[PDB]
């Protein structure tokens, strides 16, 4: 009972890709490590001027969707406006082959 | 890209120790992400604000 300061929000100890990890408490830390490593290698969109902005490498998908899950931060990372991938419907089944 | 603007990088040398700053420290709180580290021979070298 002798505080002088409180943080704005505990969620803001993270970093850039670290924001994108949904429920980042609810896993194990090396998985977060591979996720931050992996997210740099994702396609999607990068800018909007790309009809003019020539470059050597460029990867643009077709139909980008904001993720159904999100945290509050990537609203500020503008990621809702410009997303990385799109949602799909995944299944968890050992479906006998592959 | 918005990741890659805010990068940091230290020099150390070839082999180095381990209690020396290759691994994270309690002082790092509120400043640097304790997850967003690159992997492979430089983990704990590059770090992200």
């Amino acid at each position: 009972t002798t505080f002088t300061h409180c943080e704005i929000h505990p969620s803001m100890i993270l970093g850039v890709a670290a924001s994108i990890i949904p429920f980042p408490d609810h896993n194990q830390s090396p998985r977060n490590t591979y996720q931050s490593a992996m997210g740099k290698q994702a396609m999607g969109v990068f800018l909007t001027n790309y009809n003019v902005r020539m470059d050597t490498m460029a990867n643009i998908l077709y139909y980008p969707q904001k993720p159904l899950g999100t945290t509050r931060a990537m609203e500020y990372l503008k990621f809702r406006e410009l997303p990385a991938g799109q949602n799909a419907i995944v299944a968890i089944a050992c479906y006998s082959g592959y | 890209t918005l990741s890659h603007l805010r990068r940091t990088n230290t020099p150390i040398g070839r082999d180095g120790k381990l209690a020396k700053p290759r691994q994270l420290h309690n002082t790092h709180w509120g400043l640097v992400c304790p997850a967003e580290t690159p992997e492979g021979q430089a983990c704990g070298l590059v770090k992200n604000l």
């Binding site: 929000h9 500020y76 | 604000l49």
Partner: peptide, 30 residues
């Protein structure tokens, strides 16, 4: 009242003002 304390939900507006001021690339820019 306006002089009430602040619930945990509220601080996102503070974050809004802070980012609208500074911007992400503020370090390099400054």
């Amino acid at each position: 009242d306006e002089s009430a304390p602040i619930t945990a939900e509220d601080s996102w507006a503070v974050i809004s003002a802070f980012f609208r001021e500074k911007g992400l690339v503020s370090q390099q820019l400054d």
